[PDB]
């Protein structure tokens, strides 16, 4: 089957933290960053240290490929990416359009859905 | 020369999908997070996210074992699926900035980088040295507009297209996560590229064309081979049920056309019937069916049925594809332009209704002739050279906005 | 997989000083880095010849010497046994002892107690050499201006030209191939001649601070003894602009024409990285030219050495494929003149294969795809013709090993161990079957498996090269023709042995007899042809295969072959093509339009026959249509195979008027350019064939008419008529076809003689940028094919008519252009030589008498090559049909004695090909003392080169060949 992979987006200290864990390569980090997704399939809870930070899934507007490489030069591409999962210190942890992402992740792409995207004329 | 990866080669599914439905032709390269019937994480709960640093090195120096153990030099890795994975090697992200490009290489296939340098006039020390690619001096633009004197510009290249790349920096918030059945995977990844608008090198078909009809009965062609290559049976047989579940748009009498020339049927006492292997049908080796479809070919058909199913929901009927404005920005109306202007056929709208940006950013790829002459020649490479250089400041500028 | 060659070796350094140009000589010190093999390695043998060592040492002890040449003759110098087959096997097992290919001895140096005493300890040693080269008799070249005062200084030059295994011939080595070793390399030079050699410019300044320099040239990268050449004298250009590292050396006052030539290089190395997907796998690359060749295409290590007739200098629009279709091939053998290896003589052919391939795949994508067919279809009008001459062009794995022949190729001699038995037209073929073989490969095989295998095979060798000498496991740049098979069957293991085993291990041409069947002519049988061959002499049966077909308009049919070869095959059967009036174009090929009735189409639906169109099998095919179809195929087929296949099979036997037709739309459209010259040599034949059915016109001057409009062109074409290169050619070829247009009352082309003259009136100014030179010289040579051979009825050869009338026009025109090129001169006296060869067939006619004195004096010594090759070949022809014995002795004295070796390969290359004396037809008595001073030159005056005795052992071929002379 397609492997599944999508961005995740932390606070940033929070992010750092993650960040050590993962440039630290210790087995632990298992415990330390968990994922929980809700039954509705677009909220949810990730735990940094037991901290439950809540989450949202929304859905990239641009289209993104994730490539594999060995010599840097000839890349194969290994998924497609059009979602982030992004946490937030604040929000609901269990909620009882609004994940429509307008942005790129990269700074030149602010405001592609508004801006750069040729919008389709009905009819 | 451009080596895509054996599950790639092979046309393997679900690598290359031998049929997408309406919903899947809307999600076509942006597929949305399903859950799982059983395993691991079909299960509620927190699940653990694990490193993969020790994983990385281990196949990082294993892969460098087997090059220096025969006994150096270059060496292809991606031989199986499961080298494909994203669990080991360098990465990097690559972020279209065109929603739906009129190409698009599936997960397996294989691009370049070339890094194109413009040498500067007298002494030239030599180009700038990058993370990735390989350098290409040229004196002659592979793209509409020209480079500078002293100017670097990054690309992908492959078979199918050519699109210019600008390195910038991942997000110190955002990470790769890796999800399969049995866990989620994480790994560190600074390098992004944006991808600009792509310059086509392989012809997008029409719908119901006789190209586009040939590719699809090929590919039922080889799709019914490699069944045949998958049965255990002597003498090789299989069953119309297994071609109708991959292939359920298809009527079962276009399946009897592609069936009648390599095997006979044998009726058995029960609604499930077998196609035996003709005898005196040798039938093709792995590597002939290769060169029956190539990966390229696919894409072209992928591009077309999406496009056309986005046609049909925007209240485009068949018979629209004197032309409608949003019918010109269709892959097959966009490639053929642009190859066509490639060859020195004609020339490109360029500012015009096709621009994808919507905002003068990029480029209208719709006909318009050759035909004082030298000056509307001139202002073609005028408009094309503005646009360039300004799609070249645009997506490689670090400005917050 | 290894070589049983013993004493290993790493490392060499020459030292040339003292190089003389008064007496001429040179004097030189060689160290040698070996590894021996085993103990008791006592007899160390090297090889040279033409070379008096001065002393031998290893390590400050002079040990012994033993200096043989049995490359010379016989042991006995009065070997009655003078016929060939004594002589064939007699030096080929003295040649074969003369190669260190087993326990022999040329230079056996024996190893003194002592040192083997340390041999028993350390198998590690040093070799110094003290010799000089004499006056080089067959190693080397001093070109000389023969003015010795001043311009010996500036207008000399010194370099090596010489065969595959001429190292010998300059400074003493192994069997010079299939050694790995690297070298230093100390040049004593004149300050401002320089010298190139392989390697790198390790050390040089202004050097030895006394009067001259001194130059060190390096080759690190493992290379072998046979890539090794030196040429010293010439001006350095880098043509670099687009690839920075590109090396030229030419001669003063020839240096801004290579600003023409050298460039598309920069192009090619772009093609063969595309290809290879490497860099240029050197430093490096250096190029030389020269006046000689011993061989025209010379190709070394980073370095190809050649001649200068191929500069081409941007207004001489005939060489515009000649120049870098050469230098395709001294890029591509460079390569496998590198690294890819042969480990034996009787493994290279997988070489010359690639190497040539290669270049094929250049020009596929550099110019003419069809003239790349067109370049295949010569290449089988080689390889027929000389199989049909000769027996086969074998490609061994298999020795004689034992004293044992196995030798059905030795129609005249040996092959199998050694390259310097061969012909050149053997040699020649050699490369030839060299190149369709690898297109079999192609047919067998992907393309982009080829770029694999190639990939993986530069791969293993620059990985094996460019290291510290990993010993014991070093060689595998020795990619010979077995581990390369096994490569082959790795990247795709398919039946291939048997494809060597038809072509690489059966030497034969295959013609067939495919004979035309006709079934659905409305019969009940189906489509249906038979398969026939058997033609013995030279013959082989090749088995199954397919055919391809065209039908009116429809499918590529293509039907299977068997062996047991008395076969009648069918065709994938067309539809009922009926009603054909209404199907007028049911898809011929694409959106082709064609309609023609005219074929004998009441029960018709095929068109065309063909075996293997892409020419997988060597073949020479024989068979019989409907003369509509072959016509039709000239009104349009998507094959240049078929359009001159057609072409010579209509100019066999038709003549209606609609043939005529028919050529002539052919020639006027965009189909092909050489098309059109056979099509007009098509209309030479058919016109011949118009004496009493001359009902089309006198044909072709329409052709000038209704193509050719400069201003309208009011009866007349004259101005101006280039930049279209259709039209150059065209121009070029035509009026020769129209003087060959005869018909029988005095074969009266009255008409056309006038008419040519007038185009020979009617030339350019400076108007054309082109310098309208071929085509005088083809204008020439169409009154030179204005043969009149029935003037002088009784005697009327001696000044008696100042004979008459257009003979004496003619005359007038050449003697004016042997002027004007005597005065003018344009481009190497090509139209010289046209002239020359036009003499040559007037004295063949008995109008200027067979005198040879003219040609003899363009036999000398200070003309040009091609001037002194021309009257060459027409004083050859001069004693074939004239009996002149004296010139003929004067001949092979020149044979013996000149110093351009590329005369005396071509003097024996087409005395052989066009004999006096011919074997069991002598009347010119070649019994008498010819033999003798024949079988002298074979024996004497020869060792200069090999292929000076391999072309006599071709005069002994040809002359008197399988048996005594019938002297005694």
Same mark, same amino acid.
């Given at each position: 089957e397609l492997e599944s992979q999508f961005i995740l987006r932390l606070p940033p200290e929070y992010a750092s933290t993650v960040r050590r864990a993962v440039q630290s390569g210790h087995v632990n980090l298992k415990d330390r960053l968990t994922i929980e997704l809700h039954p509705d399939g677009r909220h949810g809870i990730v735990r940094v240290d037991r901290v439950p930070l809540a989450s949202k899934l929304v859905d990239l507007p641009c289209v993104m490929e994730s490539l594999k490489t060995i010599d840097k030069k000839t890349f194969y591409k290994t998924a497609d990416i059009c979602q982030m999962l992004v946490s937030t210190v604040d929000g609901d942890l269990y909620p009882p359009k609004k994940f429509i992402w307008n942005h790129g992740i990269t700074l030149p792409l602010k405001n592609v859905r508004k801006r750069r995207f040729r919008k389709t004329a009905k009819k | 020369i451009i080596q895509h990866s054996i599950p790639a080669v092979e046309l393997r599914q679900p690598f290359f999908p031998t049929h997408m439905g309406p919903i899947k032709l809307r999600q076509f390269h942006r597929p949305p997070l399903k859950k799982y019937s059983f395993g691991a994480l079909s299960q509620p709960g927190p699940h653990s996210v694990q490193p993969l640093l020790k994983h990385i090195k281990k196949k990082a120096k294993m892969r460098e074992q087997e090059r220096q153990a025969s006994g150096g030099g270059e060496m292809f890795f991606m031989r199986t699926p499961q080298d494909l994975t994203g669990k080991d090697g360098d990465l990097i992200l690559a972020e279209y900035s065109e929603e739906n490009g009129p190409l698009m290489m599936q997960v397996g296939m294989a691009t370049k980088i070339k890094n194109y340098y413009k040498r500067k006039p007298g002494k030239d020390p030599g180009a700038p040295d990058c993370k990735y690619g390989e350098t290409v001096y040229c004196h002659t633009s592979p793209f509409l507009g020209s480079l500078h004197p002293g100017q670097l510009l990054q690309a992908f290249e492959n078979n199918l297209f050519r699109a210019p790349i600008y390195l910038h920096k991942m997000p110190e918030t955002d990470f790769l996560i890796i999800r399969t059945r049995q866990g989620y995977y994480i790994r560190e990844l600074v390098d992004i590229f944006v991808v600009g608008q792509q310059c086509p090198l392989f012809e997008v078909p029409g719908p119901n064309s006789k190209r586009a009809n040939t590719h699809i009965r090929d590919f039922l062609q080889v799709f019914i081979y490699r069944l045949f290559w998958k049965s255990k049976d002597r003498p090789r047989r299989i069953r119309m049920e297994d071609i109708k579940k991959a292939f359920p748009s298809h009527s079962e009498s276009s399946i009897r056309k592609r069936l009648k020339l390599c095997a006979d049927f044998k009726r058995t006492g029960m609604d499930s019937n077998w196609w035996v292997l003709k005898s005196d049908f040798r039938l093709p080796t792995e590597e002939e069916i290769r060169a029956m479809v190539s990966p390229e070919q696919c894409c072209a058909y992928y591009s077309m049925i999406a496009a056309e199913q986005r046609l049909k929901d925007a209240g485009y009927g068949e018979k629209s594809f004197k032309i409608d404005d949003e019918v010109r920005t269709a892959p097959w109306n966009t490639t053929r332009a642009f190859i066509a202007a490639m060859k020195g056929k004609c020339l490109l709208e360029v500012t015009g209704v096709a621009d994808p940006t919507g905002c003068g950013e990029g480029f209208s790829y719709v006909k318009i002739p050759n035909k004082s002459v030298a000056e509307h020649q001139e202002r073609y490479k005028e408009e094309c050279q503005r646009i360039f250089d300004l799609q070249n400041k645009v997506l490689s500028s670090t400005e917050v906005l | 997989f290894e070589s049983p060659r013993p004493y290993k070796l790493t490392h060499q350094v020459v030292c040339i000083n003292n190089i003389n140009f008064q007496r001429k000589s040179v004097v030189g010190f060689v160290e040698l880095t070996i590894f021996p093999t085993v103990a008791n390695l006592n007899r160390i043998k090297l090889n040279s010849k033409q070379c008096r060592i001065y002393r031998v040492r290893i390590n400050d002890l002079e040990a012994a010497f033993i200096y043989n040449d049995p490359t010379l003759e016989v042991c006995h110098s009065e070997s009655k046994q003078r016929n060939l087959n004594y002589f064939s096997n007699a030096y080929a097992a003295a040649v074969s002892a003369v190669? /260190?290919? *087993? +326990? !022999? +001895? =040329?230079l056996c140096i024996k190893v003194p107690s002592e040192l083997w005493k340390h041999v028993d300890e350390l198998k590690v040693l040093k070799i110094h050499i003290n010799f000089s080269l004499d006056q080089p008799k067959g190693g080397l070249h001093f070109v000389v201006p023969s003015v010795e005062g001043s311009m010996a200084e500036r207008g000399a030059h010194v370099f090596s030209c010489g065969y595959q295994n001429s190292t010998r011939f300059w400074f003493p080595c192994v069997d010079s191939y299939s050694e790995l070793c690297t070298w230093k390399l100390e040049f004593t030079v004149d300050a401002a001649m320089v010298a190139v050699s392989n390697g790198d410019l390790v050390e040089t300044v202004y050097t030895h601070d006394m009067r001259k320099k001194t130059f060190h040239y390096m080759l690190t990268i493992p290379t072998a003894a046979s890539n090794i050449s030196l040429a010293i004298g010439p001006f350095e250009i880098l043509? #670099? /602009?687009?690839?920075?590292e590109v090396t030229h050396f030419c001669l003063p006052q020839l240096l801004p024409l290579l600003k023409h030539t050298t460039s598309y290089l920069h192009e090619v190395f772009e093609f063969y990285e595309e290809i290879l997907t490497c860099r240029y796998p050197y430093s490096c690359f250096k190029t030389v030219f020269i006046d000689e060749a011993y061989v025209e295409v010379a190709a070394y290590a980073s370095m190809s050495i050649f001649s200068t007739n191929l500069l081409h200098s941007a207004m001489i629009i005939d060489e515009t494929p000649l120049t870098r279709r050469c230098l395709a091939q001294s890029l591509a053998q460079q390569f496998f003149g590198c690294f890819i290896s042969r480990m034996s003589w009787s493994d290279e052919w997988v070489l010359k294969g690639i190497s040539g391939y290669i270049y094929g795949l250049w020009m596929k994508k550099t110019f003419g795809v069809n003239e790349y067919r067109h370049w295949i279809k010569e290449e089988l009008d080689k390889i027929v013709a000389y199989e049909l001459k000769t027996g086969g062009v074998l490609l061994h794995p298999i020795f004689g090993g034992g004293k044992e022949k196995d030798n059905p190729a030795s129609h005249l001699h040996f092959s199998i161990k050694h390259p310097h038995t061969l012909s050149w037209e053997y040699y020649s073929m050699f490369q030839c079957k060299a190149h369709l073989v690898m297109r079999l490969i192609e047919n067998r095989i992907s393309m982009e498996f080829m770029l694999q295998v190639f990939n993986k095979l530069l791969s293993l060798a620059s990985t094996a090269s460019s290291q510290k000498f990993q010993s014991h496991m070093w060689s595998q740049m020795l990619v010979s023709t077995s581990g390369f098979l096994k490569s082959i069957s790795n990247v795709s293991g398919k039946d291939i042995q048997p494809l060597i085993k038809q072509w690489v291990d059966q030497s034969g041409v295959v013609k067939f007899y495919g004979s035309f069947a006709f079934n659905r002519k409305r019969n009940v049988l189906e489509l249906e042809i038979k398969q026939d061959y058997t033609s013995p002499g030279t013959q082989k049966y090749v088995g199954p295969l397919k055919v391809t077909v065209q039908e009116l308009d429809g499918s590529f049919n293509h039907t299977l072959q068997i062996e047991e070869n008395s076969l009648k095959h069918d065709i994938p059967c067309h539809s009922k093509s009926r009603r054909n009036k209404k199907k007028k174009i049911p898809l011929m090929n694409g959106e082709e339009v064609d309609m023609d009735l %005219? *074929?004998? #189409? *009441? #029960? %018709? /639906?095929l068109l065309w026959i063909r075996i293997d169109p892409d020419m997988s099998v060597l073949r020479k095919v024989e068979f019989e249509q409907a003369d509509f179809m072959w016509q039709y195929q000239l009104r349009y087929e998507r094959d240049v195979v078929a359009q001159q296949e057609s072409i010579l099979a209509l100019e066999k036997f038709p003549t209606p008027a609609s043939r005529l037709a028919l050529t002539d739309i052919l020639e006027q459209e965009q189909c092909f350019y050489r098309v059109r010259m056979s099509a007009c040599f098509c209309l030479a034949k058919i016109a011949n064939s118009m004496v009493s059915t001359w009902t089309g016109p006198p044909a072709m001057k329409s052709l000038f008419t209704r193509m050719f409009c400069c201003k309208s062109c009011p009866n007349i074409v004259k101005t101006n008529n280039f930049m279209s290169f259709q039209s150059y050619f065209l121009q070029k070829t035509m009026p020769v076809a129209m003087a060959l247009l005869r018909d029988v009352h005095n074969l009266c082309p009255k008409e056309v003689l006038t008419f040519i003259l007038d185009l020979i009136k009617y030339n350019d100014n400076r108007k054309n940028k082109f310098s309208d030179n071929y085509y005088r010289a083809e204008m020439i040579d169409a009154l030179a094919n204005s043969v009149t051979p029935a003037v002088s009825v009784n005697n009327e050869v001696r000044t008696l008519d100042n004979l008459n009338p257009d003979v004496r026009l003619i005359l007038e025109e050449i003697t004016r252009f042997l002027n004007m090129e005597k005065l003018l001169p344009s481009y190497r006296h090509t139209i010289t030589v046209s002239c020359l060869r036009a003499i040559r067939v007037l004295q063949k006619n008995g109008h200027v008498p067979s005198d040879p004195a003219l040609f003899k004096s363009y036999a000398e010594y200070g003309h040009f090559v091609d001037i002194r090759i021309a009257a060459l070949e027409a004083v050859v022809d001069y004693t074939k049909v004239d009996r002149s014995y004296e010139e003929l002795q004067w001949l092979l004295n020149m044979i013996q004695n000149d110093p351009v070796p590329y005369v005396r390969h071509k003097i024996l290359n087409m005395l052989t090909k066009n004999p006096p004396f011919t074997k069991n037809m002598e %009347? /010119?008595?070649? !019994? =008498?003392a010819l033999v003798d001073q024949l079988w002298k030159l074979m024996n004497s005056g020869t060792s200069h080169d090999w292929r000076l005795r391999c072309g006599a052992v071709d005069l002994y071929f040809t002359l008197f060949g399988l048996s005594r002379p019938s002297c005694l």
């Amino acid at each position: 089957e397609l492997e599944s992979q999508f961005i995740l987006r932390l606070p940033p200290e929070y992010a750092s933290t993650v960040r050590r864990a993962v440039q630290s390569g210790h087995v632990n980090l298992k415990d330390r960053l968990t994922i929980e997704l809700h039954p509705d399939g677009r909220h949810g809870i990730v735990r940094v240290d037991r901290v439950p930070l809540a989450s949202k899934l929304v859905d990239l507007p641009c289209v993104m490929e994730s490539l594999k490489t060995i010599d840097k030069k000839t890349f194969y591409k290994t998924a497609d990416i059009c979602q982030m999962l992004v946490s937030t210190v604040d929000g609901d942890l269990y909620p009882p359009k609004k994940f429509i992402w307008n942005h790129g992740i990269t700074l030149p792409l602010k405001n592609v859905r508004k801006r750069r995207f040729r919008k389709t004329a009905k009819k | 020369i451009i080596q895509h990866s054996i599950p790639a080669v092979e046309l393997r599914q679900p690598f290359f999908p031998t049929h997408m439905g309406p919903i899947k032709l809307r999600q076509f390269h942006r597929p949305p997070l399903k859950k799982y019937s059983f395993g691991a994480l079909s299960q509620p709960g927190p699940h653990s996210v694990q490193p993969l640093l020790k994983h990385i090195k281990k196949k990082a120096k294993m892969r460098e074992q087997e090059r220096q153990a025969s006994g150096g030099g270059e060496m292809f890795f991606m031989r199986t699926p499961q080298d494909l994975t994203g669990k080991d090697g360098d990465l990097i992200l690559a972020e279209y900035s065109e929603e739906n490009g009129p190409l698009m290489m599936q997960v397996g296939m294989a691009t370049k980088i070339k890094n194109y340098y413009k040498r500067k006039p007298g002494k030239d020390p030599g180009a700038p040295d990058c993370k990735y690619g390989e350098t290409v001096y040229c004196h002659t633009s592979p793209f509409l507009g020209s480079l500078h004197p002293g100017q670097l510009l990054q690309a992908f290249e492959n078979n199918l297209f050519r699109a210019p790349i600008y390195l910038h920096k991942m997000p110190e918030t955002d990470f790769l996560i890796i999800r399969t059945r049995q866990g989620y995977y994480i790994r560190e990844l600074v390098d992004i590229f944006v991808v600009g608008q792509q310059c086509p090198l392989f012809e997008v078909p029409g719908p119901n064309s006789k190209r586009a009809n040939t590719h699809i009965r090929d590919f039922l062609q080889v799709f019914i081979y490699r069944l045949f290559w998958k049965s255990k049976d002597r003498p090789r047989r299989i069953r119309m049920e297994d071609i109708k579940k991959a292939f359920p748009s298809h009527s079962e009498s276009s399946i009897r056309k592609r069936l009648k020339l390599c095997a006979d049927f044998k009726r058995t006492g029960m609604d499930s019937n077998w196609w035996v292997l003709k005898s005196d049908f040798r039938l093709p080796t792995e590597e002939e069916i290769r060169a029956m479809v190539s990966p390229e070919q696919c894409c072209a058909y992928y591009s077309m049925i999406a496009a056309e199913q986005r046609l049909k929901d925007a209240g485009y009927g068949e018979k629209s594809f004197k032309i409608d404005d949003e019918v010109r920005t269709a892959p097959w109306n966009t490639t053929r332009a642009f190859i066509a202007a490639m060859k020195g056929k004609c020339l490109l709208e360029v500012t015009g209704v096709a621009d994808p940006t919507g905002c003068g950013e990029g480029f209208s790829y719709v006909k318009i002739p050759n035909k004082s002459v030298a000056e509307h020649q001139e202002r073609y490479k005028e408009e094309c050279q503005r646009i360039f250089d300004l799609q070249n400041k645009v997506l490689s500028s670090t400005e917050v906005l | 997989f290894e070589s049983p060659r013993p004493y290993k070796l790493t490392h060499q350094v020459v030292c040339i000083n003292n190089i003389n140009f008064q007496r001429k000589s040179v004097v030189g010190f060689v160290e040698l880095t070996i590894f021996p093999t085993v103990a008791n390695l006592n007899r160390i043998k090297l090889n040279s010849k033409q070379c008096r060592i001065y002393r031998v040492r290893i390590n400050d002890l002079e040990a012994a010497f033993i200096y043989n040449d049995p490359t010379l003759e016989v042991c006995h110098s009065e070997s009655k046994q003078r016929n060939l087959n004594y002589f064939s096997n007699a030096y080929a097992a003295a040649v074969s002892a003369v190669d /260190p290919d *087993a +326990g !022999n +001895g =040329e230079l056996c140096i024996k190893v003194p107690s002592e040192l083997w005493k340390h041999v028993d300890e350390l198998k590690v040693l040093k070799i110094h050499i003290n010799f000089s080269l004499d006056q080089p008799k067959g190693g080397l070249h001093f070109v000389v201006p023969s003015v010795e005062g001043s311009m010996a200084e500036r207008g000399a030059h010194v370099f090596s030209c010489g065969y595959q295994n001429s190292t010998r011939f300059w400074f003493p080595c192994v069997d010079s191939y299939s050694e790995l070793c690297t070298w230093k390399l100390e040049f004593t030079v004149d300050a401002a001649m320089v010298a190139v050699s392989n390697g790198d410019l390790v050390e040089t300044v202004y050097t030895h601070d006394m009067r001259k320099k001194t130059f060190h040239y390096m080759l690190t990268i493992p290379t072998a003894a046979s890539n090794i050449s030196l040429a010293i004298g010439p001006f350095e250009i880098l043509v #670099d /602009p687009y690839m920075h590292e590109v090396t030229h050396f030419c001669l003063p006052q020839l240096l801004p024409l290579l600003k023409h030539t050298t460039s598309y290089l920069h192009e090619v190395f772009e093609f063969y990285e595309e290809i290879l997907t490497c860099r240029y796998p050197y430093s490096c690359f250096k190029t030389v030219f020269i006046d000689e060749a011993y061989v025209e295409v010379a190709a070394y290590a980073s370095m190809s050495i050649f001649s200068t007739n191929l500069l081409h200098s941007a207004m001489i629009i005939d060489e515009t494929p000649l120049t870098r279709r050469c230098l395709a091939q001294s890029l591509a053998q460079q390569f496998f003149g590198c690294f890819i290896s042969r480990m034996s003589w009787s493994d290279e052919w997988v070489l010359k294969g690639i190497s040539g391939y290669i270049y094929g795949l250049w020009m596929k994508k550099t110019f003419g795809v069809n003239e790349y067919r067109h370049w295949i279809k010569e290449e089988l009008d080689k390889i027929v013709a000389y199989e049909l001459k000769t027996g086969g062009v074998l490609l061994h794995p298999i020795f004689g090993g034992g004293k044992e022949k196995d030798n059905p190729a030795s129609h005249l001699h040996f092959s199998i161990k050694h390259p310097h038995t061969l012909s050149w037209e053997y040699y020649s073929m050699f490369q030839c079957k060299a190149h369709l073989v690898m297109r079999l490969i192609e047919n067998r095989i992907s393309m982009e498996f080829m770029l694999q295998v190639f990939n993986k095979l530069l791969s293993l060798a620059s990985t094996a090269s460019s290291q510290k000498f990993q010993s014991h496991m070093w060689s595998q740049m020795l990619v010979s023709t077995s581990g390369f098979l096994k490569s082959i069957s790795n990247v795709s293991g398919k039946d291939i042995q048997p494809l060597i085993k038809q072509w690489v291990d059966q030497s034969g041409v295959v013609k067939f007899y495919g004979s035309f069947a006709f079934n659905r002519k409305r019969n009940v049988l189906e489509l249906e042809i038979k398969q026939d061959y058997t033609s013995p002499g030279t013959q082989k049966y090749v088995g199954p295969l397919k055919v391809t077909v065209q039908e009116l308009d429809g499918s590529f049919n293509h039907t299977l072959q068997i062996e047991e070869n008395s076969l009648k095959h069918d065709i994938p059967c067309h539809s009922k093509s009926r009603r054909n009036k209404k199907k007028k174009i049911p898809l011929m090929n694409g959106e082709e339009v064609d309609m023609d009735l %005219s *074929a004998m #189409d *009441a #029960d %018709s /639906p095929l068109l065309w026959i063909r075996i293997d169109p892409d020419m997988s099998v060597l073949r020479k095919v024989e068979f019989e249509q409907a003369d509509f179809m072959w016509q039709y195929q000239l009104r349009y087929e998507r094959d240049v195979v078929a359009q001159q296949e057609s072409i010579l099979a209509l100019e066999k036997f038709p003549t209606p008027a609609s043939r005529l037709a028919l050529t002539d739309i052919l020639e006027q459209e965009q189909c092909f350019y050489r098309v059109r010259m056979s099509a007009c040599f098509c209309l030479a034949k058919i016109a011949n064939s118009m004496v009493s059915t001359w009902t089309g016109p006198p044909a072709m001057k329409s052709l000038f008419t209704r193509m050719f409009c400069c201003k309208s062109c009011p009866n007349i074409v004259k101005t101006n008529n280039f930049m279209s290169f259709q039209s150059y050619f065209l121009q070029k070829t035509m009026p020769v076809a129209m003087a060959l247009l005869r018909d029988v009352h005095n074969l009266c082309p009255k008409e056309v003689l006038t008419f040519i003259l007038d185009l020979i009136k009617y030339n350019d100014n400076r108007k054309n940028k082109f310098s309208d030179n071929y085509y005088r010289a083809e204008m020439i040579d169409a009154l030179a094919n204005s043969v009149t051979p029935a003037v002088s009825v009784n005697n009327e050869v001696r000044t008696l008519d100042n004979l008459n009338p257009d003979v004496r026009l003619i005359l007038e025109e050449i003697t004016r252009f042997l002027n004007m090129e005597k005065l003018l001169p344009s481009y190497r006296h090509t139209i010289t030589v046209s002239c020359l060869r036009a003499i040559r067939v007037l004295q063949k006619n008995g109008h200027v008498p067979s005198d040879p004195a003219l040609f003899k004096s363009y036999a000398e010594y200070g003309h040009f090559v091609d001037i002194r090759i021309a009257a060459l070949e027409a004083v050859v022809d001069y004693t074939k049909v004239d009996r002149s014995y004296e010139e003929l002795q004067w001949l092979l004295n020149m044979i013996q004695n000149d110093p351009v070796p590329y005369v005396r390969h071509k003097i024996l290359n087409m005395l052989t090909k066009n004999p006096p004396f011919t074997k069991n037809m002598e %009347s /010119p008595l070649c !019994n =008498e003392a010819l033999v003798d001073q024949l079988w002298k030159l074979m024996n004497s005056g020869t060792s200069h080169d090999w292929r000076l005795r391999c072309g006599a052992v071709d005069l002994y071929f040809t002359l008197f060949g399988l048996s005594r002379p019938s002297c005694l």
